[PDB]
Amino acid sequence: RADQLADESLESTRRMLQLVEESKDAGIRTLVMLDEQGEQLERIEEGMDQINKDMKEAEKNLTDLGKFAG
Amino acid sequence: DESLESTRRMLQLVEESKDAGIRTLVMLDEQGEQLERIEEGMDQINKDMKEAEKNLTDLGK
Amino acid sequence: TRHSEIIKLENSIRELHDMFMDMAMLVESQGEMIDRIEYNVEHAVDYVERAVSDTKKAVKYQS
Amino acid sequence: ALSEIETRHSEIIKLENSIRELHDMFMDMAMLVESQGEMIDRIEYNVEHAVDYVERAVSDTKKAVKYQ
Amino acid sequence: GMDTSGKQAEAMALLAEAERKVKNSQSFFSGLFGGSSKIEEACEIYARAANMFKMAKNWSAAGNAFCQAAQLHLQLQSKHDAATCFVDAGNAFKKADPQEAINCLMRAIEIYTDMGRFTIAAKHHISIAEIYETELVDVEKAIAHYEQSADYYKGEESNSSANKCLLKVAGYAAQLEQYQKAIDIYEQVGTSAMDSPLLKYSAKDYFFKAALCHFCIDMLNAKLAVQKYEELFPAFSDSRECKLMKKLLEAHEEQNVDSYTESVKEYDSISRLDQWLTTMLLRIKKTIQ
Amino acid sequence: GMDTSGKQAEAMALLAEAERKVKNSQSFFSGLFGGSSKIEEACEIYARAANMFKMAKNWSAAGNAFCQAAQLHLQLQSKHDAATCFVDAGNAFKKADPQEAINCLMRAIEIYTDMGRFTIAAKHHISIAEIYETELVDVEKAIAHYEQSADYYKGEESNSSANKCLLKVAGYAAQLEQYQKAIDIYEQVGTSAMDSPLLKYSAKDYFFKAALCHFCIDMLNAKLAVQKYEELFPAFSDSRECKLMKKLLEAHEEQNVDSYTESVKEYDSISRLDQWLTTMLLRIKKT
Amino acid sequence: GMDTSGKQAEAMALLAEAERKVKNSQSFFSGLFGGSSKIEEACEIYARAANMFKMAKNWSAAGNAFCQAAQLHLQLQSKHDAATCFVDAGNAFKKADPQEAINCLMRAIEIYTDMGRFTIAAKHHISIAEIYETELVDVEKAIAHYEQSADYYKGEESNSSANKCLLKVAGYAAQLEQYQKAIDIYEQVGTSAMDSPLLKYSAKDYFFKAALCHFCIDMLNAKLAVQKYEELFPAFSDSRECKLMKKLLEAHEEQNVDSYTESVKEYDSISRLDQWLTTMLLRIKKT
Amino acid sequence: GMDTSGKQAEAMALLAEAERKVKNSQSFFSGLFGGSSKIEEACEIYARAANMFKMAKNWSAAGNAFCQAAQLHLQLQSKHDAATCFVDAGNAFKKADPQEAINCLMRAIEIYTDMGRFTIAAKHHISIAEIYETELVDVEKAIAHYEQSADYYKGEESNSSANKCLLKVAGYAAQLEQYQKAIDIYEQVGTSAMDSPLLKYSAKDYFFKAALCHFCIDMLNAKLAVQKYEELFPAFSDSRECKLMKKLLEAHEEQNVDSYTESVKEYDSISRLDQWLTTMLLRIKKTIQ
């Protein structure tokens, strides 16, 4: 029965090696990828808060100016 | 005998990884869901601001 | 018994591989959305700043 | 047969290592993406508030212009 | 609940108030000529009534009020707000009347593309196709909407969304439509992922699908395409799908249904089916004679 | 800042010159009636005084200043600013004394509902539910808040958030032994998750939980329910959950404690359990 | 189909009214001095005409209209809108004829850098490099654009973005029988990946490549490089790459071509190679 | 470089124009009135020149121009533009000479905290801490900056950033500072994570670090701490970290170098070790006597 033992062992080792390495490299590429989205989100957050401040101050000063005119 | 306990360890690690990857999928999905709403809000504000400022500038003339 | 447990391992590893195949496309699509939203917000900020500044100077200096 | 079992011992060692690398790897994933989720929530809230504020701003400014 | 009944009562009251407001608005335009405020305040009343009415759990009249307010706002040369209200009315009608929601969303799509926004139009097209196919049994219109959405996405180099739409369209075509479009789209999507930063190994499945379609056409085309993909894409050579396809083809060659049945059974036992490959395999088996 | 208390005293004085401003409202605005912007800057000083109170870690003073600024500013105008100030006061009150945070959040909820903003309203509803859970002991009010938030989410097709809120509600109800609601929710969410591929891997857990809830009430119907689940999903039996449930129910026919005790111990040997399942099993298997 | 034909018909109509607009607007400016609103209106007419040309599936004329709008607008003393129009024209010209897309994208980059924003400039540089690489064979211009983009990214502390460009440049330089640049980039990136809590796994990979290219010169230098890298990276010997390289060195020492080829084939069998590595190995085997 | 040569030539020309504009500012402040607009134009040209300097690789000149523009703009009753220009100057000074970057960043922090934006202030605090640790050989100011950033983060409910900041500061203090703080923060983070399903099955490592910190000072307290940990966290007993510590303390009690050394060498076989744990073990071993 050692023939089936050897055949199944060879099949098992090959499949485990290939699947393990593939899953490894896969997750690896995801790891490398995530940081780009992280920094993009940081930059957009900076930009949006800048927009908010600028527009708020502009409108409040403009309401003040309109009140002064009237 | 060591092979059997090693198999037990492999089962434990594999099932833990799967049970956590499933919720990783879930939370990735909610992030994707949030993205569309935020983008739609951004486009709407841009559209409104552009029309407003251009109309006011035209009226200024 | 070894055959049964290795078949279980076969199952589990296959599902793990399929799950990564699933995560990949979703993550890439999220990134694709992120780039476009970033571009649009940068355009919006630039336009808002310049328009408001120029209009304010023009409507403040004529007096 | 002895060489076969030795190779399988090497294989089990490699499998332990790789499952010892993937587990920690996934934990890193989980923490980083949770941080990203929190921060996207914050930015979305701020964006929606800005949208509402600017909409009411244009409404009020146009009404004031109408008064003129 | 008291909240419901009160909401509906005040909604009827404010709808009557809006109607009398618009009629008095038409009267006053000639009587005093106050401009166009009267109509805009009427539209605000309409919008508030509609929103609080859809809080009353009632949808159809909420969407009707949304559409009426949007029309009375668009008649004042204001378009973007009217289009957003059209989209909101379509969302409300989604659970009330599919036809009205579809019409309002088509109006929104056309006005948006007239403005020049393609991504929003494509998203609305995808929503239209999804709602059309999920509840109403029909595909061809859904296929056209998906193709239009993919075209709009490709117009602005949105590769991922267009790829997903083309994949879905090709799958639908293969299930029902002729296999030439499916073959072309599947092969193109599979070959557009050889340098994928994260999907360097997923295209194999797509290739397999293409091969299956070829084997749906003829055995000669099946083998020729399998070879072409074998040489063109070396990695697919070591894929399990390649061995399975070779075994199935060689079994079908000699007309031994037992070999084909055992091959498919062992493949399914090794790995679970997907409910789309099984029907294809059953169709192939039906033509074993 | 640990040494920023001199300017927080000066900020009590800033709120005091806001008091001088309301004194102007009392007497001086007769000639300064056009000074509505003056009231606005009074609110502005209010806000920044409150802000440095927040910087000084005086949560009670910061919340009081926030509420005062909200009340002064909500002069039937700029309701959005009043709502933002109220939610800021609620967040400041979250620590220390959160009771008044509840009422201010309720007011902001009402303001947003009148305006028509729903996601923020449901998020604040979840916030009040969780602050009830973690600080107070009331759960029924938390249940009502979760139900209302899930209704708001489902109104706009926000399926996933409402599904998770309903899952939490079902867990609480099972803890509160209202099994009909729990089974209905666990199985509505399971059947909804199984519909799309992206979540078909999760339905098993929901089904198993629903089966336990069903097995809690009627033993005789538990077999029929599990058979219905198995036939509904062909790949439900293969999961260890269905096999373990079958073992438990078939061993329960005869009064042998050892059988189910060893079954649960063997299952626990592969992975640790949680408080909910262990408590449910301990309560149920007693009889 | 009919949609495109109509769009094209009314678009030609709109271009007729647009040329009428520009002519009559300059005439009205000369004869009445109405300001500058008419020029802006002509600009928006050009923009919508270009957009409907794009909807009509005519990219050349749409890009021409975009460029005309951009030049007229910048003539109106406004850049950001002009830059947006220029980049839109470049995107329209990307397909069909990209030659003028190169020049218009360079103008967009120039205006962006004159304003002083770097990230968009680097993005456009890498886009132009990709255009050169995919559509043309002049790899030198691609190298110049890639290195300029890398300089921009590194100057703005975007190390991750710079590393990709550096790797691309190193690979391209190694392709054109220049190894100093490739060696320097490979070793620098390998060293920079030493202490990365994430990238450490791949620190070896880059190193390996360097040695291979470093072997293109002679044998003893390759041995010195591998041993030095091994001392620098104590774990580098664990991987098979070192074993394979030692096999190659020992086989090549004694003119054992057969063992060299058999080891290469075995490594291919266990793990297949790419075009770059295969070509480099065959070139090395040539001597 | 010809490109850089012409770039520097035009930069010098713009510097001459900036000198003209500053003399114009002084003339409009002492000779004319309403110079606010003129000095705003001066600021605009200053920003243009400084950004071009940054493009020209002259980091010092770009930073100096940005700082001068900021300080000139401060006089116009405006603060946020000053904050942006100051942070830009600090970013320019990050490379080359970062010392003045520290002070300008402190000014920006003061302005931001005066305004109210806590999160940006905390981000700048951690940036200051990281630059200080990477380029300045001193840790106490880093340990301080990490603490304020952690306070800012946890005060605004941002839990994850605060948790990582506390963990990093405590881990760094453990190396060169008394271990009571290390124990406190490690225990706090572990207990907070235990309930949370994120770090619950990784908190074992934090418990291991806390156990080592206890082990360094004295034996009995370490035994009490590890017993308390395994009591509170039953799944910690089976952990590979608990058997390690038990054998290690058994060896240490008997005062046998070989057993401890060979045990640590074995445990190394699994993965390897880290720069901190090896030093930790060596330090505690050196005092075996």
Swiss-Prot record, chain B:
Which residue ranges run through the membrane? none
Q: How is it modified after translation?
A: Palmitoylated.
For this UniProt record, the keywords arranged alphabetically read as follows:
Cell membrane, Coiled coil, Cytoplasm, Lipoprotein, Membrane, Palmitate, Phosphoprotein, Repeat, Synapse, Synaptosome
Name any one GO molecular function: transmembrane transporter binding
Any one cellular component term from GO for this entry?
A: plasma membrane
> For this chain's UniProt record, which GO biological process terms are given?
associative learning; axonogenesis; calcium ion-regulated exocytosis of neurotransmitter; endosomal transport; exocytosis; locomotory behavior; long-term memory; long-term synaptic potentiation
What are the t-SNARE coiled-coil homology domain coordinates in residue numbering?
A: 1-59
Does Membrane count among this protein's keywords?
yes
List every stretch annotated Interaction with CENPF. 1-53
Explain the purpose of this protein: t-SNARE involved in the molecular regulation of neurotransmitter release. May play an important role in the synaptic function of specific neuronal systems. Associates with proteins involved in vesicle docking and membrane fusion. Regulates plasma membrane recycling through its interaction with CENPF. Modulates the gating characteristics of the delayed rectifier voltage-dependent potassium channel KCNB1 in pancreatic beta cells.
> How does this polypeptide assemble, per the annotation?
Part of the SNARE core complex containing SNAP25, VAMP2 and STX1A;this complex constitutes the basic catalytic machinery of the complex neurotransmitter release apparatus. Recruited to the SNARE complex following binding of the SNARE complex component STX1A to STXBP1. This complex binds CPLX1. Found in a complex containing SYT1, SV2B and syntaxin-1. Found in a ternary complex with STX1A and VAMP8. Interacts with HSC70 and with SYT9, forming a complex with DNAJC5. The interaction with SYT9 is inhibited in presence of calcium. Isoform 1 and isoform 2 interact with BLOC1S6. Interacts with CENPF.
Q: Which family does it belong to?
A: Belongs to the SNAP-25 family.
Q: What is this protein called?
A: Synaptosomal-associated protein 25
Gene name, Swiss-Prot/TrEMBL: Snap25
The range of the complete sequence contained here reads 23 to 83 of 206
UniProtKB/Swiss-Prot annotation, chain D:
Q: Which residues of the full protein are shown?
A: 191 to 258 of 288
Predominant location of this chain?
A: membrane
Cross-link Glycyl lysine isopeptide (Lys-Gly) (interchain with G-Cter in SUMO) lies at K62, K63, K66
Q: How is it modified after translation?
A: Phosphorylated by CK2. (Microbial infection) Targeted and hydrolyzed by C.botulinum neurotoxin type C (BoNT/C), which hydrolyzes the 253-Lys-|-Ala-254 bond. Cleavage inhibits neurotransmitter release.
Site ((Microbial infection) Cleavage) at: K63, A64
GO molecular function terms noted in the UniProt entry: ATP-dependent protein binding; calcium channel inhibitor activity; calcium-dependent protein binding; chloride channel inhibitor activity; identical protein binding; kinase binding; myosin binding; myosin head/neck binding
Chain ranges of the t-SNARE coiled-coil homology domain: 2-64
Name of the protein in question: Syntaxin-1A
Question: Where in or outside the cell?
Answer: Cytoplasmic vesicle, Secretory vesicle, Synaptic vesicle membrane; Cell membrane; Synapse, Synaptosome
Q: Which family does it belong to?
A: Belongs to the syntaxin family.
BP GO terms, sorted: calcium-ion regulated exocytosis; exocytosis; hormone secretion; insulin secretion; intracellular protein transport; modulation of excitatory postsynaptic potential; neurotransmitter transport; positive regulation of calcium ion-dependent exocytosis
Indicate the quaternary assembly. Part of the SNARE core complex containing SNAP25, VAMP2 and STX1A; this complex constitutes the basic catalytic machinery of the complex neurotransmitter release apparatus. The SNARE complex interacts with CPLX1. Interacts with STXBP1. The interaction with STXBP1 promotes assembly of the SNARE complex. Interacts (via C-terminus) with KCNB1 (via C-terminus); the interaction increases in a calcium-dependent manner and induces a pore-independent enhancement of exocytosis in neuroendocrine cells, chromaffin cells, pancreatic beta cells and from the soma of dorsal root ganglia (DRG) neurons.
GO cellular component annotations, sorted alphabetically?
A: acrosomal vesicle; actomyosin; axon; endomembrane system; glutamatergic synapse; membrane; neuron projection; nuclear membrane
Q: Which UniProt keywords apply?
A: Cell membrane, Coiled coil, Cytoplasmic vesicle, Exocytosis, Isopeptide bond, Membrane, Neurotransmitter transport, Phosphoprotein, Synapse, Synaptosome, Transmembrane, Transmembrane helix, Transport, Ubl conjugation
Tissues expressing the protein? Expressed predominantly in cerebral cortex, hippocampus, cerebellum, adrenal medulla and retina with weak expression detected in non-neuronal tissues.
